[PDB]
Amino acid sequence: MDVFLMIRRTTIFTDSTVFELKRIVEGILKRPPDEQRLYKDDQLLDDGKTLGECSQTARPQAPATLAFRADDTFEAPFSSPP
Amino acid sequence: NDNHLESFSVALCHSTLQKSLRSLDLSKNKIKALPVQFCQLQELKNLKLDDNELIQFPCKIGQLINLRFLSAARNKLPFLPSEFRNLSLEYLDLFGNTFEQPKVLPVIKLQAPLTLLESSARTILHIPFHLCQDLDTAKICVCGRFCLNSFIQGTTTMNLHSVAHTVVLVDNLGGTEAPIISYFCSLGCYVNSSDM
Amino acid sequence: MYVKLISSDGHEFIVKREHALTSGTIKAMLSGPGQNEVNFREIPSHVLSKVCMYFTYKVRYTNSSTEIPEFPIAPEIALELLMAANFLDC
Amino acid sequence: TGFQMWLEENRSNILSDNPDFSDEADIIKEGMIRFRVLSTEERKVWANKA
Amino acid sequence: MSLKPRVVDFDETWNKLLTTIKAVVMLEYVERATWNDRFSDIYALCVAYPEPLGERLYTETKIFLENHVRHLHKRVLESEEQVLVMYHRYWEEYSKGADYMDCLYRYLNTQFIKKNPLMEIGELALDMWRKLMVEPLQAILIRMLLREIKNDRGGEDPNQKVIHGVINSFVHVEQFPLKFYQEIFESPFLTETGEYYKQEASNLLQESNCSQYMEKVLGRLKDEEIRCRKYLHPSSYTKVIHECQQRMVADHLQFLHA
Amino acid sequence: AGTVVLDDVELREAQRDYLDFLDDEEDQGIYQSKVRELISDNQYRLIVNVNDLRRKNEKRANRLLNNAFEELVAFQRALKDFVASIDATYAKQYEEFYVGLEGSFGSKHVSPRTLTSCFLSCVVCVEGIVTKCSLVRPKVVRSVHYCPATKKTIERRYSDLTTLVAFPSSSVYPTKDEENNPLETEYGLSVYKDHQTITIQEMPEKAPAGQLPRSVDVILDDDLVDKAKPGDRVQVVGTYRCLPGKKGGYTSGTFRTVLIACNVKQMSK
């Protein structure tokens, strides 16, 4: 437990299942979990899976690292000190 | 010597005297504290401050690398700055200054905030007034080992022959030592607990 | 319920309101007359994102039995972090 | 450190005895007092555990 | 510009901030991006140029707010026989604005507090709002306030909520507000009510047999207790009731002892 | 003369390593016991075995043998910390607690012939025969002076090319206050240490064919000042140093070399 994740969008900070993660996304963007997709880069993440399967290396001081429904299904760098 | 000065001139520190002054005497004046930018006077070799109301040295006194003679006897100093260890004096006089005796441990805690961590770490890699204030509050580069943040402050005891080859015995019963501000990351805190 | 924190680079970091409200200046920027979102012309993207990362443990464990694990900091970044933290009161 | 490990494992007891401690400084302070009351052998156990 | 020191117009930053203080005063809505840019402007002022301009920011803030308080004083002076009524909501809105001021000037507060103008600017705004009670509106306010509070066994029930609002405004501001509240309002009010009840107790003693006097004085003490509960703040109840009992009793103790 | 600055970071690292070595409690307790006996016998020199130091920390042992002075002051400061931890009353009786070395030193085992300039600043173990002793004479290390006019005491501590110190030091004996008042020495409150010079000669049977035996001068201080007499076959462990001299604005680069001993062992009985 206590997995915190960054979700690229710039990113959402989130913290449990992928379904709960989609509920966190709904908590601001308001679209239901059925109208969302989540990935590990190119690899899709299914709703029922725990975020540990996507593993407690995403510790909250350094959390690790999104698409929406078009009509019926979901589809479609930082700076340095000078 | 023997005037009525309430304080040394603050803006005078960054004047021509910054590069030129080699002897300064402010003894027998009711100065209670020198300004923190007094450390700009890095040309200084001789400094005399005795018989004053002086309750602290400036914390950045360690930048006075030219300093060889220091006299601050019968002042109000409770303990020495942490950067006093960086001095390499020839002569040191601190007689009758009423330093504190106890080995108590009233340590200031960090809480590990990002601001304290930044002020600690940026001193090792450093005009901006915030940066200058952070330099003044560097806490000796966030303590000499296991650095976390520039606020973990306490006090230990120092032998004055570490910094001067001639020392006036500050008090009796041996009396060759005085307290000094310290920083207590890990083993330092362990040693402080052992001392207390 | 949520808060969006915009860096000067345009990168936008979207956090829970308690996480944003941990810091003094940001909870002030989230408090204005007559009325969420804050933007910072001061802070670059990397520093603001890492400040959000610091928030994510500061909310998770404060007055916790567990430790605070080491935040991601470097001395080269620490100057920018000093200025940013002095602005933000994080 | 061994002291920090002890404090992490005993912060709940400190807070249960003193619910008015809002600041981590006073919690560390009370923890230092209790950790001083511990015996030499117990403090060795914590030093080896660390 | 980024967070490092660079050339930024102090007058422009102060002017945009000034037009934002014009919203903070009386609680007009301000757009969020502009509100954040005011923090950015304060940072550009107060970091280094090469000294921090926080003193300029604080002094100009004090001057602008004092111009507003002078206008508020003029409008209150214009509001004949309604000065406390307008002043209640004026101080409420301006104190909420002071809260938003303490929010807005946060960077200046942390920069300057190590030297303490420039520290708790909302507290500065309130302490300077008390300059309205330094002006001659102090007498105009307290006279009508204590009069309508002194409505009693006759004319009754003024706007007690508004009156308590003014009393709270007096018992808020100090930089120990009870001393200021007493020197402005409570000493005159307490002494005048004590004089009134001295006259009333004298009249009751003149008119009444002992039983009549007894029920009359205790009933009127209960009346003033209810009056305290209704019109006044909780710090004044005991003092008023004690001043009233020190004239219904202990001023005429010989009659009781007989 | 004699004052040298050391890098505090490596000094603290070395002192940490040596204090870890000396705090032998969890292991067999060898050096816990030896420091207890040092306290009990009223001694202030601990003889450490570099074999044990190699078993516990090999790199620190190698750096000790190759960088003798800085490593030895680190070790002696660690020893003072440890003896203070055991008995804080006893730790203040002596200005400094010394460490001598025994065991096997690898290639640093030498004779006066093979002891060349390559070994300067190294710990060396020289085996030979004693051919000369000087008379034991006191050497001032710390003098206390009482100013009768000002009614205050100054205390000064000294050094020379022989005595490298790693703390600030003088080499001039004072005679006047900063107010130009005379100063009276407090001999009883001053600290002096015994000093003697000996000469160790190569064993004659080991000399090459046509050669006469060679010699090395050795400086013994403190308890070692009368541990060897002429005719003794000895092993001296110490630091090999040169003494840069000068003569009236000029120096001949020829510097005499001495072995500042830290341990002396007989080879008989």
PDB file of N, CA and C in Angstrom, chain E residues 4 16 25 32 43-44 56 60 67 69 76 84 88 121 133-134 151 162 164 169 179 211 217:
ATOM      1  N   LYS E   4      15.511  34.638 -10.206  1.00  0.00           N
ATOM      2  CA  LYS E   4      16.769  35.310  -9.924  1.00  0.00           C
ATOM      3  C   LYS E   4      16.580  36.830  -9.990  1.00  0.00           C
ATOM      4  N   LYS E  16      -0.187  47.838  -9.942  1.00  0.00           N
ATOM      5  CA  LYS E  16      -1.091  46.708 -10.141  1.00  0.00           C
ATOM      6  C   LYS E  16      -1.552  46.145  -8.801  1.00  0.00           C
ATOM      7  N   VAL E  25     -10.118  45.794  -0.319  1.00  0.00           N
ATOM      8  CA  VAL E  25     -10.994  46.700   0.409  1.00  0.00           C
ATOM      9  C   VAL E  25     -12.393  46.573  -0.177  1.00  0.00           C
ATOM     10  N   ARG E  32      -8.035  34.875 -10.564  1.00  0.00           N
ATOM     11  CA  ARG E  32      -7.045  34.071  -9.850  1.00  0.00           C
ATOM     12  C   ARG E  32      -5.636  34.284 -10.394  1.00  0.00           C
ATOM     13  N   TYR E  43       7.222  39.353  -4.819  1.00  0.00           N
ATOM     14  CA  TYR E  43       8.526  38.692  -4.827  1.00  0.00           C
ATOM     15  C   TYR E  43       9.557  39.530  -5.572  1.00  0.00           C
ATOM     16  N   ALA E  44       9.185  40.030  -6.755  1.00  0.00           N
ATOM     17  CA  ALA E  44      10.091  40.872  -7.532  1.00  0.00           C
ATOM     18  C   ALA E  44      10.458  42.143  -6.778  1.00  0.00           C
ATOM     19  N   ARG E  56       9.398  50.009   0.942  1.00  0.00           N
ATOM     20  CA  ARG E  56       8.612  50.823   0.020  1.00  0.00           C
ATOM     21  C   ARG E  56       7.218  50.241  -0.158  1.00  0.00           C
ATOM     22  N   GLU E  60       3.955  52.369   1.141  1.00  0.00           N
ATOM     23  CA  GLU E  60       2.958  52.771   0.158  1.00  0.00           C
ATOM     24  C   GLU E  60       1.617  52.094   0.430  1.00  0.00           C
ATOM     25  N   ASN E  67      -5.419  56.609   2.979  1.00  0.00           N
ATOM     26  CA  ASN E  67      -6.315  57.393   2.137  1.00  0.00           C
ATOM     27  C   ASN E  67      -7.717  56.794   2.143  1.00  0.00           C
ATOM     28  N   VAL E  69      -9.012  54.988   4.589  1.00  0.00           N
ATOM     29  CA  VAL E  69      -9.585  55.186   5.919  1.00  0.00           C
ATOM     30  C   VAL E  69     -10.006  56.636   6.107  1.00  0.00           C
ATOM     31  N   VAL E  76     -18.357  58.294   7.053  1.00  0.00           N
ATOM     32  CA  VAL E  76     -18.976  58.072   8.356  1.00  0.00           C
ATOM     33  C   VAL E  76     -19.451  59.392   8.950  1.00  0.00           C
ATOM     34  N   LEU E  84     -22.580  54.310  13.527  1.00  0.00           N
ATOM     35  CA  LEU E  84     -22.263  52.965  13.995  1.00  0.00           C
ATOM     36  C   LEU E  84     -22.820  51.906  13.052  1.00  0.00           C
ATOM     37  N   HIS E  88     -20.241  49.306  11.337  1.00  0.00           N
ATOM     38  CA  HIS E  88     -20.216  47.868  11.602  1.00  0.00           C
ATOM     39  C   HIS E  88     -19.854  47.080  10.347  1.00  0.00           C
ATOM     40  N   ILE E 121       0.747  42.595   7.538  1.00  0.00           N
ATOM     41  CA  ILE E 121       0.176  43.772   6.890  1.00  0.00           C
ATOM     42  C   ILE E 121      -1.321  43.875   7.154  1.00  0.00           C
ATOM     43  N   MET E 133     -11.010  55.659  15.060  1.00  0.00           N
ATOM     44  CA  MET E 133     -11.275  55.950  16.465  1.00  0.00           C
ATOM     45  C   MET E 133     -10.208  56.835  17.100  1.00  0.00           C
ATOM     46  N   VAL E 134      -9.129  57.137  16.376  1.00  0.00           N
ATOM     47  CA  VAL E 134      -8.249  58.237  16.787  1.00  0.00           C
ATOM     48  C   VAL E 134      -8.822  59.582  16.315  1.00  0.00           C
ATOM     49  N   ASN E 151     -30.968  52.601  26.192  1.00  0.00           N
ATOM     50  CA  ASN E 151     -32.415  52.396  26.076  1.00  0.00           C
ATOM     51  C   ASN E 151     -32.889  51.371  27.105  1.00  0.00           C
ATOM     52  N   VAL E 162     -26.069  44.715  15.332  1.00  0.00           N
ATOM     53  CA  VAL E 162     -25.156  45.728  14.803  1.00  0.00           C
ATOM     54  C   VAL E 162     -24.351  46.364  15.937  1.00  0.00           C
ATOM     55  N   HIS E 164     -23.517  44.980  18.816  1.00  0.00           N
ATOM     56  CA  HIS E 164     -22.499  44.004  19.187  1.00  0.00           C
ATOM     57  C   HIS E 164     -21.396  43.928  18.144  1.00  0.00           C
ATOM     58  N   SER E 169     -15.780  45.132  17.003  1.00  0.00           N
ATOM     59  CA  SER E 169     -14.780  45.914  16.285  1.00  0.00           C
ATOM     60  C   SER E 169     -13.869  46.647  17.258  1.00  0.00           C
ATOM     61  N   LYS E 179      -8.118  47.041  26.938  1.00  0.00           N
ATOM     62  CA  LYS E 179      -7.698  48.361  27.406  1.00  0.00           C
ATOM     63  C   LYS E 179      -8.183  49.458  26.461  1.00  0.00           C
ATOM     64  N   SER E 211     -40.061  45.844  51.405  1.00  0.00           N
ATOM     65  CA  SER E 211     -40.435  44.752  50.504  1.00  0.00           C
ATOM     66  C   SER E 211     -40.505  45.224  49.052  1.00  0.00           C
ATOM     67  N   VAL E 217     -35.378  46.318  43.255  1.00  0.00           N
ATOM     68  CA  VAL E 217     -33.954  46.338  42.931  1.00  0.00           C
ATOM     69  C   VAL E 217     -33.523  45.006  42.331  1.00  0.00           C
TER      70      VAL E 217
END
